[PDB]
Amino acid sequence: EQMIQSVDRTAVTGASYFTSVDQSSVHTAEVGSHQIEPLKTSVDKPGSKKTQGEKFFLIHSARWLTTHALFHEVAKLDVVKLLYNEQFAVQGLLRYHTYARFGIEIQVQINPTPFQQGGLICAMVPGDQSYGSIASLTVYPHGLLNCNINNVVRIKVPFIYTRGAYHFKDPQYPVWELTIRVWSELNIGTGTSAYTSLNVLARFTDLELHGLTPLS
Amino acid sequence: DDSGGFSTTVSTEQNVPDPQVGITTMRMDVSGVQAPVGAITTIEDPVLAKKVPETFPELKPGESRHTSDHMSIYKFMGRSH
């Protein structure tokens, strides 16, 4: 008595997010393998979320002048909403996902010539620009800019939100928001440049993605 | 590195709560003899902003006269408003 083997019928086959149970199974054919190359035509690392989510995106840039008086709101920029944009690399990770958890890394770059004087402030503001004081904004994790010491600072801020995760397609309220008040007025002499440059870079830290959607 | 990046200018997360207990107690002169390094500093550097401040020869202020800490929230807002 010799038994001839047959084909399997019922099995749990499919992805963790793409699951379909078949009543008639078949062995999937596979020839070859993932052949390694001693000669690679490109010299980079392979792409991942670790190198696509953690990369600075220029979300905003301005130009601060002399005519801006004290505590004038130069820029009112939203953090995550400008990150969720088609012209950046994180759109390929945020279009196919709905609910997320992440940390925000802000880096702000300005450039004074040292014949100018003055000061700028960038603050990471959650919720609202409500009746809280402008002269009390140092309680926020912020940055202070000066025409004397340095011109590039970077800010690490966490996820500050009421619910569990953030909805991109219909948010309750924006998680973070940055503002630029004139911390000290831009004073020059004759022939000195009456302006300075301004850049706002941003990236994600510790990114989590959940809730895949088929629609756009 | 975890994210494969780098950092050159010293600036990080700021304003962690509860720096100090507000009841006055002893942890001699506080300053004096040594020149004050904590007066002049860089506020644009947050590590240099966390330096022990002084400007004058000072000594121990002493202790307080109420064991009830009037600077903790759990005994401050016990009065109902």
Place this chain on the structure above:
Amino acid sequence: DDSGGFSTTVSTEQNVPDPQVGITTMRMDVSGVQAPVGAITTIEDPVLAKKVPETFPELKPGESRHTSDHMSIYKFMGRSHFLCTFTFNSNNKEYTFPITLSSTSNPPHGLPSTLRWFFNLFQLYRGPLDLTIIITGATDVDGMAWFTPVGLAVDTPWVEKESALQIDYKTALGAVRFNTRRTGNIQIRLPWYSYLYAVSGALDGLGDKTDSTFGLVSIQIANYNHSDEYLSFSCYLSVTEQSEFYFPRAPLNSNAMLST
């Protein structure tokens, strides 16, 4: 699991080459007494399709009568087969012929009989060749034959014309110097010079005119001719041992196997 998935119906990658050595040798009856389980089976299951077949009581066929394995490629294609033929007519005429592995290239302009069937048996191709040509006709002609890789400039293929390329372009790349009287024979390696990795046999579009071809040999003559006698060359290609084959393909029909 590596990908976090699952598989229920047994079906995987198929048609791995070299199942068996084709020379006949002994590894008694093969079948008989035991009932044939290998006759009836499921071809839709590839594991059940890889069962040892039998239908009858058979025994050992024996050994073969030639030690030379006539079923390995490295000793089968050692016989050199036709590529092209061409004649010169006037003084300093420069001839140019490619090696176009496309099956669209009907003979003579392309692959003839044995090369068109064989080099369209498989998808990918990598390695050097061998070329054997014969000088036939008028004697005492001092010509020159050179190889030109892809990317670099060369004259128009399948066209006998005057050379528009200078000798410093010809001496720097590599050629040979010979007369028809001294040795009268060339057996040459064809160098594998490409920035791309491998070449194909049957493609479409701009990939067919670029990724199928790999090399080209072009010839200009001199001292041809004196008192009128035709000089005829003919190209026969042969194989070497540093080439390897990839992705066995369905062979061509009886229609495109055109013979010259």
Place this chain on the structure above:
Amino acid sequence: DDSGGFSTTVSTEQNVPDPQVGITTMRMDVSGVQAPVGAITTIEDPVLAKKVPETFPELKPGESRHTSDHMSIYKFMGRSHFLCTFTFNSNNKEYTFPITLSSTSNPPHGLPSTLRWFFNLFQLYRGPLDLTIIITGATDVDGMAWFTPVGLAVDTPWVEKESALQIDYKTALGAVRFNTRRTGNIQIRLPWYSYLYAVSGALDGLGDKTDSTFGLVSIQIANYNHSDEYLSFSCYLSVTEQSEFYFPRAPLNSNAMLST
């Protein structure tokens, strides 16, 4: 100190040859995690200019696909490149051609395409060469080719004329005897015969006409000719292993690299 002096600003001798072997092989990520110190640097400081460069997270490129190193001179210039060509016209005509490494010597009278670029890449030159010539045209011509060093007398260069030099001057120095029918090929070492040490590529004045040139090969024929057929010779120079290069020089422009 040896000279009793001092040095404050860091600046020394520069541009030592052979920094790296050019075949691609492995000596994981090259950069990435650590911040790039090799991107921004001081080029005015040559110690800071010798820092390991990076700007991006990179990893190992891998190996190459040819064991033959195509970036060493001793296997790059093994391919022989054009020098000159000349034809004979009458009986016992003596031809004379030098090997003039001057970049002022425009081709044909001097260095042509590959020799003019390559032998003006460097200042000093010492060692023997290789010359490969081809007999093309009328057959059964018994000529003679000989070398003549510097200082000794020889006939006028780049001029086809009758020989004014006796055979006892020709047999004592060194030559060859050959017919066009027997072997039809010459691959010859060029002897390094000079009382000076090395030769240059680009000089001026009387140093250019003396210290750039090192050798000369001059040819007289006989039995040329019978029934009228042109005999054409062409000179291709090649390299050997006993020569060494000195003082890497800025390469020539695109204008003086004239091709023939």
